[PDB]
Amino acid sequence: VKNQIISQPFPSLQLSISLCHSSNDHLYVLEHNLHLLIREFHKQTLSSIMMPHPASAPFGHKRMRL
Amino acid sequence: RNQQLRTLQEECDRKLITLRDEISIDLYELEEEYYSSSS
Amino acid sequence: NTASLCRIGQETVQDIVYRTMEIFQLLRNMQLGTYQDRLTKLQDNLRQLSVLFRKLRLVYDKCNENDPIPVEQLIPYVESEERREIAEVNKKLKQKNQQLKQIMDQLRNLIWDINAMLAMRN
Amino acid sequence: STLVDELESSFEACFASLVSQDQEEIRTGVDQCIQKFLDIARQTECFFLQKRLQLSVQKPEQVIKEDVSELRNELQRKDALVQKHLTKLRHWQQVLEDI
């Protein structure tokens, strides 16, 4: 809607994710995992897996080379 | 700065893991007692 | 009293057979200092078993001292302050069990949260 | 007579091949001794259960007394468990406070 996402994963269930901006029932686990998920999503770009140890080898992920 | 923060993170995670194991053993004892209660 | 003596007498016969099984396992493993340790374990097991036999004869005599109703008259075919004591202790450990359930649920939830949060850090 | 004494005699009979001064002799002797031993054990358990049944139909206050005792031991055991757990929780709060 504006700052609130509402989902219905199970039919009797309603999940709500809201960004509370103070501008001066809550589950902590999902908030903490949200921070870690976006942190892993950042670190995927800046990973050392993209580095090619063979100097001639161009670039990109390691298993995609394999 | 990076090395100091990594050491603090590792100390916190070791404390949490040992806490989880001790709490798990207590939970096993409490589960046996509660489920085997006659009532 | 006597209706717990019957329970103890059943438990003695249940212990005697288990103890003879443990004795036969000790005699199975004995390979001709640990020689002497197995000797001590064997002699101690045999001592406890003789104690169990004496206790069993005691319990037999006590229950056989203390029947006007023959059995098969006791089965139902188709066609007072101690009760209040029972109700008191029943209500007591009803409350105790519900509090124990709350403690157990909070421990479960803390363990699940710890494992989820630590699983996502990698 | 006196099933205790038959139990004692059969138990001593289980060992008779060892204590004196190949395979099939040992096998048949062991099978017969162990079967008579377990049979007299089951008869002794049957005797104790029949006597308990006659007590539970004639004198039912004793059963209620044993139930009172068992529920009281359940109460004391629950309190011992929760006290040990509470001491461990307070120790872990003192550990986790110091990071």
From Swiss-Prot, chain A:
It comes from the Eukaryota. It is linked to Microcephaly, postnatal progressive, with seizures and brain atrophy: A disorder characterized by postnatal progressive microcephaly and severe developmental retardation associated with cerebral and cerebellar atrophy. Infants manifest swallowing difficulties leading to failure to thrive, jitteriness, poor visual fixation, truncal arching, seizures. There is no acquisition of developmental milestones and patients suffer from marked spasticity and profound retardation. Progressive microcephaly becomes evident few months after birth. It is found in: Nucleus. This is Mediator of RNA polymerase II transcription subunit 17. Belongs to the Mediator complex subunit 17 family. Ubiquitous. Component of the Mediator complex, a coactivator involved in the regulated transcription of nearly all RNA polymerase II-dependent genes. Mediator functions as a bridge to convey information from gene-specific regulatory proteins to the basal RNA polymerase II transcription machinery. Mediator is recruited to promoters by direct interactions with regulatory proteins and serves as a scaffold for the assembly of a functional preinitiation complex with RNA polymerase II and the general transcription factors.
From Swiss-Prot, chain B:
It is found in: Nucleus. Residues 1-22 form a coiled coil. Component of the Mediator complex, which is composed of MED1, MED4, MED6, MED7, MED8, MED9, MED10, MED11, MED12, MED13, MED13L, MED14, MED15, MED16, MED17, MED18, MED19, MED20, MED21, MED22, MED23, MED24, MED25, MED26, MED27, MED29, MED30, MED31, CCNC, CDK8 and CDC2L6/CDK11. The MED12, MED13, CCNC and CDK8 subunits form a distinct module termed the CDK8 module. Mediator containing the CDK8 module is less active than Mediator lacking this module in supporting transcriptional activation. Belongs to the Mediator complex subunit 22 family. Component of the Mediator complex, a coactivator involved in the regulated transcription of nearly all RNA polymerase II-dependent genes. Mediator functions as a bridge to convey information from gene-specific regulatory proteins to the basal RNA polymerase II transcription machinery. Mediator is recruited to promoters by direct interactions with regulatory proteins and serves as a scaffold for the assembly of a functional preinitiation complex with RNA polymerase II and the general transcription factors. This is Mediator of RNA polymerase II transcription subunit 22. The lineage of its organism: Eukaryota, Metazoa, Chordata, Craniata, Vertebrata. The gene is MED22.
UniProtKB/Swiss-Prot annotation, chain C:
One of its GO terms (cellular component) is nucleoplasm. GO terms for molecular function: nuclear thyroid hormone receptor binding; nuclear vitamin D receptor binding; transcription coactivator activity; transcription coregulator activity; ubiquitin protein ligase activity. It is found in: Nucleus. Expressed in brain, heart, kidney, liver, lung, pancreas, placenta and skeletal muscle. Residues 34-58, 80-117 form a coiled coil. Its main location: nucleus. Keywords: Acetylation, Activator, Coiled coil, Nucleus, Transcription, Transcription regulation. The keyword Disulfide bond does not apply. GO terms for biological process: positive regulation of DNA-templated transcription; positive regulation of transcription elongation by RNA polymerase II; positive regulation of transcription initiation by RNA polymerase II; protein ubiquitination; RNA polymerase II preinitiation complex assembly; somatic stem cell population maintenance. Component of the Mediator complex, a coactivator involved in the regulated transcription of nearly all RNA polymerase II-dependent genes. Mediator functions as a bridge to convey information from gene-specific regulatory proteins to the basal RNA polymerase II transcription machinery. Mediator is recruited to promoters by direct interactions with regulatory proteins and serves as a scaffold for the assembly of a functional preinitiation complex with RNA polymerase II and the general transcription factors. The chain holds residues 29 to 178 of 178 of the full protein.
Swiss-Prot record, chain D:
One of its GO terms (molecular function) is actin binding. It is found in: Nucleus; Cytoplasm; Membrane. One of its GO terms (cellular component) is core mediator complex. Induction: Up-regulated by endothelial cells when exposed to tumor conditional media. Residues 62-98 form a coiled coil. Widely expressed. Highly expressed in vascular tissues such as placenta, testis and liver. Keywords: Actin-binding, Activator, Coiled coil, Cytoplasm, Membrane, Nucleus, Transcription, Transcription regulation. It is a peripheral membrane protein. GO terms for biological process: negative regulation of smooth muscle cell differentiation; positive regulation of transcription elongation by RNA polymerase II; positive regulation of transcription initiation by RNA polymerase II; RNA polymerase II preinitiation complex assembly; somatic stem cell population maintenance. It comes from the Eukaryota. Component of the Mediator complex, which is composed of MED1, MED4, MED6, MED7, MED8, MED9, MED10, MED11, MED12, MED13, MED13L, MED14, MED15, MED16, MED17, MED18, MED19, MED20, MED21, MED22, MED23, MED24, MED25, MED26, MED27, MED29, MED30, MED31, CCNC, CDK8 and CDC2L6/CDK11. The MED12, MED13, CCNC and CDK8 subunits form a distinct module termed the CDK8 module. Mediator containing the CDK8 module is less active than Mediator lacking this module in supporting transcriptional activation. Belongs to the Mediator complex subunit 28 family. The chain holds residues 42 to 146 of 178 of the full protein.
